[PDB]
Write an enzyme that holds these catalytic residues in place. Structure first.
Site, PDB file in Angstrom:
ATOM      1  N   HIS A   1      -7.939  -6.919  -1.261  1.00 25.87           N
ATOM      2  CA  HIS A   1      -6.888  -5.968  -0.910  1.00 25.87           C
ATOM      3  C   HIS A   1      -5.830  -6.541   0.018  1.00 25.87           C
ATOM      4  CE1 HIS A   1      -5.214  -1.893  -0.210  1.00 25.87           C
ATOM      5  NE2 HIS A   1      -4.976  -2.367   0.999  1.00 25.87           N
TER       6      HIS A   1
ATOM      7  N   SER B   1       0.836  -1.195   0.000  1.00 25.06           N
ATOM      8  CA  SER B   1       0.000   0.000   0.000  1.00 25.06           C
ATOM      9  C   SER B   1       0.872   1.247   0.000  1.00 25.06           C
ATOM     10  CB  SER B   1      -0.940   0.006   1.206  1.00 25.06           C
ATOM     11  OG  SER B   1      -1.933   1.007   1.069  1.00 25.06           O
TER      12      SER B   1
ATOM     13  N   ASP C   1      -9.407  -5.580  -6.051  1.00 24.86           N
ATOM     14  CA  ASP C   1      -9.158  -4.515  -5.091  1.00 24.86           C
ATOM     15  C   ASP C   1     -10.035  -3.305  -5.387  1.00 24.86           C
ATOM     16  OD1 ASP C   1      -8.206  -2.844  -3.171  1.00 24.86           O
ATOM     17  OD2 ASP C   1      -6.111  -2.886  -3.819  1.00 24.86           O
TER      18      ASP C   1
END
Lengths: 697, 697, 144, 35
Positions: C121, C1, C89
C-alpha cells in the site's frame, strides 16, 4: 470412514485418459500385406509423487485397403517429460518437438538420431513460446524445409535510474503495465509469427500483420507462398479468451516477403479453426455470427482458394434438423478432418445428452450421423488420414477405450465397422439412464414455447431400500453434461448415493432457441427447472426425500445458493466451489465484464458507466438477497489466485452466514486459480466433499 | 582453424550408440504369420544442452520359426529421463522400473497403465539403491509376485551434544568414517539384499548373509525357495573394484526364511557373472584363479543344482587354441546367454585385434566361432531368447549398426544369416589395416620366447605426399584396442593425420603368456616395443619422420613420458591425461595399492612396511628419472577429484619441467574424477588436444 | 489514497484549472470498494450511514455511495494522468485504479500507468519509492 | 507496534512478550508412513 474413501479414490483415479493420436506412413511387405503404425498419448494421475504423468504408446494395424485385418500392440509404455508441442512431418520421416528442459529448445528427429537442436532462448529474438490451444501452433512447410510457430513479442530493455555502470536501455520503464488475455493466460500479451529455417538456423519474425490484432492458428498457404492465420482484435482492451467463442476475429493471409495483409472473411463476427484440404484447393472454418452469448451454435463455411468464393455448408439449427442433428456446438475441429477425396468433413458434436460423430458432404450439404442409435455414449474423434479414423469411446460406467475404423464410401457412412485396440474393464455396479422433462405451462415464455430439458440419473444396480440423492447442475450457463466417463459421480454412485445431473434450458446441444431463451432470465427460470426436475425424480423413483444434497461449481454454485435460499426445507447439505454471489460487485473485478451485462439483460458497450437501473437489476438477481433465510450446512472451497471469479464473492456469503451462527466450513487454496486442477488440491477437495456429504447424510 | 575443428567435432559426435536390447513375447495372427517386437536403448551427446540423452526405439520382426521373413521399424524415438534400472517380467506382461524423480520410486507397469508405485525413501528401510554394474541387480520371481534388488545398509541416527530439544540418537557419532569401495563408488560401503512384495507392499531385508561379505548379482533360486548371490570379501579393508577382476569373492545361496548361508564354490579365487539355465537345472559362471593381475584369462565353470557337481567347460588358453580362439577375456556374460535347449552358451570375446562371438557346448566342450573370417570388425551380443540373437556391429570406418539372427542347430553355427535393422552410413575417407610385429632377439625373455604383438593403422584414403603421424598406446596395462568405432582416431584421420594404435606384449586377447610376461618388467619392455613398432612403421610406410606425436592416458601417459624422456629426438609433441609419474609416492595415496606392488615385481601383502629395496626398485622404474632430458612441448590434462591416480603426479612433472623453461601447458578440471566423461570436459579436452597437435605439427 | 479521491474529483469537476495529475492507490468507486476492503465500516461511515454487522445491500445505500464517487465525472476529464498502483494492496484494492484507467483510455486521453507486483500500500520499498518519485518528478517537469 | 511488547520483571528474573498461537499439525490423506 476416511480409509475406505481413500482406497476407493485410489482405485478410481488409477484409470488413464487418452489425449492425442497420429498415424504413420504406409508400409508394404515383400509378401504383399500392408500395415501402418498408430501413436497415442495417455495421461494419468500419480498420487505418490502428486503429478500428472504422460506416456506414449504405439500400435500396429494390418489392413487390405478397405478393411482392417489385424490390430495389435507394439511394445510397452514410455514416460516422457518436458514435451510442450510435437508434430510429425507431412511425409512421416521427421519429427519436430518443443522441449522445456529452464530454457526452451526446438528439436528435429529422424530415425534413431536427433538430427538438429536449436536453443531459442539464446538467439534472443522473441519471448516464451505459446503452448496453449488458443494461439499455439507448430506447422511444417510443404517442402519440409521451414517451421512456423508463434511466440511472445520482444520487449525493450529497461533499467533503474540509480544503476551503477562499469568504469541502450530505457531508464524508469521496468514497471510498465502490459495487459494480458485473462484467465490461465498470465503474461501473454501480444504473440507474433516466427519462421525458422532448418538448414541454416536463422529465425525471422514476419512483418505485415495489423498493429491491432493478435495472430494465431496459422498454417502455410498452398505453394509455400505465404501464411494464413486468425487475428483477434485487442482494441480498445482485451477480454477473456478461455471458453469464450464470442470474441471478434478474422482470417488473414500474408506473404513471406514484406507486404500487406489480405482479408479473406468478414471482419464483424467470430471465426476460428481453419483447415486446408488435402489437395490444397479449399479451406473450411467455423463462424459464429453473434457476440452476445459466450457459447452458441456455429456455422461451417467454405472458401475456394482459386475462385475466391465463400459459401455456407452447415447453417444454424433452431431446434432440430431431422432426428439426429442439433447443430455444431464444438470450438475446434480435429487437425485431420478431411477425407481422402477432399469432399467430406468428419467431426463430432453433442446431440441431446450424448456426443456423436457426423460426416458432412461439402458439395450437397447433407449431414450423416455415424453413431446413431444404441443406448448412448461419448465418442471423440482424434484424427483421420487416408480414410482411417481413430476414436475414443466412453460411458458413465466404462472408462475410455480406443478404436479405429475405415470411413465407408459416400452414401454408406451408417455401416462403419470398429476394431478395438485398447479396452477397459466395465463397472457393473453403476447403472445410468436419461430422463426427459417438460416444463409446466406457467414456467414458459411466449417467445420460446414447447422447449424441454433432460437429466442423467446414476444409481447403484442391484439394491436391496431408501437411497440418498445428490443433485448437480452444470456451470456455463452454456454447457452440458454428456454420457461420458466422470470420476466423482462414479465415486458417489459406488459409495451408495444416487446422482442426478441436470441439463436445464439454455444448455448446448438442444438448439439455438434453448441457447437464447436463458439470457435475461437468470435467477428464476433455471432454478425452477432444477426444482421441477428434483420434484419429478423424487415423486417417480421413490427415493429418500429426507436426504437430498446439492453440489455445484461456478455458475452452478450460483444456482445452488439460490436453491438453499428459496427452498430451505428441501436440502440437508451443500458444497460449492468458487461460486458467484453478487453480480454488481463482480462486474468491476472480473476479466469478462460482458458476461454480467449479457446475463442481467442489457447490452455490453465499452466506455459504460454505472446506472442505477442496471445496478438494481443486477442486485435483484443475486443469491445474496436470500442469505437471511439459509439454513442448510455449507462447505465452501475457494482459490485465492482466481481471475475469472474473484474469491471475495464467497467471503461475503461466508461472513453473512457466520454472523447468524450457521454451520459453515471454508477452505482456501492460496495457489489454485480457478479449476483446482493441481493433483493435491483436487484430491483434498474431493475427499473433503465426500466426507462432508457422508457425515451429514 | 578452430571453426573447422568444431564443425567436424559436431558432425562426428552426432552419431548415437546402442546400449541395451530386450525381446517381447511371441504373437500369432489369425492368418498364421508370427512376429515379435524388439526394444533398444540408444544414447547420444547433445552439445546445446551439454548432456548425454537416452531414448528408446522399437522394431518388428516377422519370422517362420527358423528364418527371419521381415524386419521393420515400429514408430519414432522417445526420450526418457531419470530411469536407473528396468527389467521385463519373465512372461513379458509387466515391466519394473526404478526412477529418480530427489527421491527414488519403484514402478510396475502393465499395458497402458502404471499398475503400482512405491516410494522407497519414505519407507525408511535402507539407503540409496545400487544402480551400477558391479553390485546392482533387479530380479523377478518365477511366480511374478516378488522383486529382488540391492540397496545400501541403514545407518543409526546420530546428533551433536549441543542440540536443543523440544520442551534415540547416538551423540557425537555423526562424523564417523565409513570406508567406500574406491573409484566411482563414493558413499557405497555395504550393500544388502532387499525383497519387495508387490501385492501388499512390504519390504524385507534378508538375514543370514556373512558379516564380512558384500553381496551382489543375485537371482531367485529354482522354485523360489531362496536367493543366489556373489559375496565379495571386504576384510581387513576394501580395495578398488572398478576394472579389477582379481578381488576375492565366492558364490552363496541363502533361504528366504532365517537361516545359514551355503557355499557353492571355492573361497580362494575370484568368481563372477552367474547365469541360470532356462530349464532351471544348472548354473554357469566365470572363475579367475589368480589374484596377481587385475585382468587375465578366465575359466567357464558349470554347477549342477541337483547332483551338486562342479566341472570346467572352458579352461585357460596359454597362447592359442586352434586358429580362432584365445581365451575368455570378458568380465560379464549377457543377461540372456543360454540357448533354448539349455545345452549351449553364446558369448563374445576379443580375438587378436578384433572381437568375435563364440558358442560353447557345455556337454563336449568345443568352442565354435560364429564370425570367423572376413576383414575384421567388432561384434557385441546384447541378448538371446528362444534362439534369436541381437547384436551390434561396428568398425573403425563405420559407426555402430544393429542386427538380428537365428542360431543354427548344433554343429552348424558357421552358417548364421544376419538381417539388418538399423544401418549407418560409412565414411569412405578412412582406411584401416593391421600390422604384425615380431620383437628382435635381444628384447625377449627366456621364459616366454616367440611372442609377437600388433598395431592398428588408420590413414586417409586417396592421398596425393608426406603425412604426420600420431601414436597411441593403451592404458591397462592389461587391455587392448579392438577394430571398433572410435571417435577421436576418426577425427584425427579426417583432419589429415595417420593414427597408429599399439597393442604391446601384455595385452588381453593374445593368451595367458602375454598377460604374465609384462609384470615386473614395466618401464623397458613395453617402451621398447612401442619404439620398435614406430620405427618399423616409419621405415615401411614412408611417412614424414619429422612430424610424429604421442598421445596417451593413465598407463599410456606413463609410457609416453618414458618415450619422450629416453628418446628425446623422435617426437615433436605430447598430450597426456592423468598420467603416472612416481610409483613410490603413488603407492600410499591410491585406492589400489596392490597395483604398484605387482607391477614393480613384488607380492602384495596386507600389513606391509616400507623397505629400502622396494622403494629403490619403484623409483628406478619411474619416468621422473628422465625428467632432466625432456625436450618436447607437453600438454597435461588433470582431474582434481581423481581417486585412482592422484593428481599430484602430474604436478610434480609439471614443476620439474617448468623449472627448466620448457614449453608446458596445463589444464585442471576441479570436478572431473578420472575419465573426464562430462560432455563439457570431454569436448574441451579433445578440442585443446587437437588444436595443440595441429599447431605444433 | 483519499488524496487521489480528492484529486480525481477536482480534475473532473473543474477541468480547466489543472494541467497534470499524479495519483497513488486512489479510491474511485465506494460501492464496489465496500465488499473488497479490510475496513468495510469506512465506506458506511463516510457515505453517511451507520455500520452494522450482518448488513445487506440496499438500493438507497448503493445510490448514495455511487453519487459520491469521482467515477461519475469521468467523461469530463481532460488533464493528463499518471497512476501508480500496488498489486498486493489490501486496504484499497487495485482494481479501483484499473476502472478509471479503462474509462479514460477508451476516450483517447493521455494516461500513463505503473503497476508494482509486490508493493502493498505505501510503496515503502526503497526501489519502488525511488522509481515512483522519479517518475512523478519527470512527469510534472515534462508537462509543466 | 500494535501488539508487540517486551517487558522485564521488577525482580529482573523473567521476561514477557507476545507470540502467535500454536496450530495443530495436519497432513494429507494420501501421505505415506514409515514401515
Amino acid at each position: 470412514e476416511p480409509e475406505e474413501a481413500a482406497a476407493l479414490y485410489r482405485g478410481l483415479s488409477r484409470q488413464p485418459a487418452l489425449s492425442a493420436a497420429c498415424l504413420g506412413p504406409e508400409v508394404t511387405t515383400q509378401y504383399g500385406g500392408r500395415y501402418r503404425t498408430v501413436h497415442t498419448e495417455w495421461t494419468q494421475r500419480d498420487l505418490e509423487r502428486m503429478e500428472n504423468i504422460r506416456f506414449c504408446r504405439q500400435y500396429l494395424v494390418f489392413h487390405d485397403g478397405d478393411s482392417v485385418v489385424f490390430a495389435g500392440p507394439a511394445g510397452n509404455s514410455v514416460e516422457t517429460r518436458g514435451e510442450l508441442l510435437s508434430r510429425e512431418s507431412p511425409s512421416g520421416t521427421m519429427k519436430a518437438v518443443l522441449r522445456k528442459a529452464e530454457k526452451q529448445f526446438l528439436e528435429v528427429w529422424e530415425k534413431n538420431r536427433k538430427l538438429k537442436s536449436f536453443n531459442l532462448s539464446a538467439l534472443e529474438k522473441h519471448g516464451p513460446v505459446y503452448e496453449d490451444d488458443c494461439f499455439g501452433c507448430l506447422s511444417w512447410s510443404h517442402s519440409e524445409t521451414h517451421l512456423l510457430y508463434v511466440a511472445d513479442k520482444k520487449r525493450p530493455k529497461a533499467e533503474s535510474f540509480f544503476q551503477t555502470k562499469a568504469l541502450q536501455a530505457i531508464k524508469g520503464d521496468q514497471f510498465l503495465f502490459y495487459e494480458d488475455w485473462g484467465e490461465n493466460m498470465v503474461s501473454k500479451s501480444t504473440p507474433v509469427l516466427c519462421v525458422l529455417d532448418i538448414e541454416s538456423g536463422n529465425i525471422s519474425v514476419l512483418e505485415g500483420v495489423p498493429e491491432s490484432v493478435s495472430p494465431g492458428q496459422a498454417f502455410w498457404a498452398p505453394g509455400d507462398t505465404g501464411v494464413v492465420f486468425v487475428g483477434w482484435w485487442h482494441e480498445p482492451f482485451r477480454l477473456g479468451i478461455r471458453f469464450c467463442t464470442n470474441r471478434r476475429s478474422a482470417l488473414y493471409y500474408v506473404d513471406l516477403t514484406g507486404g500487406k495483409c489480405e482479408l479473406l472473411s468478414d471482419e464483424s463476427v467470430a471465426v476460428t479453426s481453419p483447415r486446408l484440404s488435402p489437395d490444397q484447393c479449399r479451406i473450411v472454418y467455423l463462424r459464429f455470427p453473434s457476440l452476445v452469448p459466450h457459447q452458441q451454435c456455429g456455422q461451417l463455411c467454405l472458401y475456394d482458394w482459386y475462385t475466391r468464393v465463400t459459401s455456407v455448408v452447415v447453417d444454424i439449427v433452431p431446434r432440430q434438423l431431422g432426428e439426429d442433428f442439433s447443430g455444431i456446438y464444438c470450438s475446434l475441429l480435429p487437425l485431420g478432418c478431411w477425407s481422402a477425396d477432399s469432399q467430406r468433413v468428419v467431426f463430432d458434436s453433442p446431440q441431446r445428452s450424448r456426443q456423436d460423430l457426423f460426416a458432412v458432404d461439402t458439395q450437397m450439404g447433407s449431414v450423416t450421423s455415424l453413431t446413431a442409435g444404441g443406448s448412448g455414449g461419448s465418442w471423440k474423434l482424434l484424427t483421420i488420414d487416408r480414410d482411417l479414423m481413430v476414436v475414443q469411446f466412453s460411458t458413465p460406467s466404462v472408462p475410455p477405450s480406443l478404436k479405429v475404423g475405415f470411413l465407408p464410401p459416400a452414401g454408406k457412412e451408417q455401416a462403419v465397422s470398429w476394431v478395438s485396440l485398447e479396452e477397459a474393464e466395465p463397472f457393473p455396479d453403476i447403472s445410468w439412464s436419461i430422463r426427459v422433462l417438460q416444463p409446466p405451462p406457467q414456467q414458459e415464455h411466449v417467445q420460446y414455447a414447447g422447449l424441454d430439458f433432460e437429466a442423467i440419473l446414476l444409481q447403484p444396480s442391484n439394491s436391496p431400500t431408501q437411497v440418498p440423492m445428490v443433485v448437480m447442475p452444470h456451470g456455463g450457463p452454456h454447457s452440458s453434461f454428456v454420457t461420458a466417463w466422470m470420476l466423482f459421480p462414479a465415486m458417489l454412485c459406488k459409495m451408495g448415493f444416487a446422482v442426478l445431473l441436470v441439463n436445464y434450458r439454455g444448455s448446448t446441444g438442444f438448439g439455438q432457441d434453448s441457447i437464447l431463451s436463458l439470457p435475461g432470465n437468470v435467477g428464476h427460470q433455471d432454478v425452477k427447472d432444477v426444482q421441477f426436475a428434483v420434484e419429478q425424480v423424487l415423486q417417480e423413483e421413490h427415493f429418500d426425500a429426507g436426504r437430498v444434497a446439492l453440489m455445484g461449481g461456478s455458475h452452478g454454485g450460483f444456482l445452488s445458493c439460490h436453491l438453499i435460499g428459496q427452498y430451505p426445507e428441501t436440502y440437508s447439505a451443500c458444497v460449492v466451489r468458487n461460486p458467484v454471489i453478487n453480480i454488481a460487485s463482480m462486474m468491476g473485478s472480473t476479466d469478462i465484464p460482458d458476461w454480467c451485462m449479457v446475463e442481467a439483460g442489457f447490452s455490453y458497450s465499452s466506455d459504460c458507466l454505472p446506472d442505477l437501473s442496471v445496478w438494481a437489476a443486477m442486485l435483484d438477481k443475486s443469491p445474496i438477497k436470500y442469505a437471511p433465510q439459509v439454513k442448510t450446512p455449507l462447505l465452501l472451497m475457494l482459490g485465492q489466485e482466481d481471475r475469472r471469479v474473484p474469491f471475495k464473492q464467497g467471503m461475503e456469503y461466508y461472513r453473512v452466514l457466520k454472523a447468524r451462527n450457521v454451520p459453515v466450513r471454508l477452505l482456501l487454496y492460496p495457489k489454485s486459480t480457478h479449476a483446482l486442477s493441481e493433483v493435491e488440491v483436487e484430491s483434498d477437495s474431493f475427499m473433503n466433499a465426500v466426507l462432508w456429504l457422508c457425515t451429514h447424510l
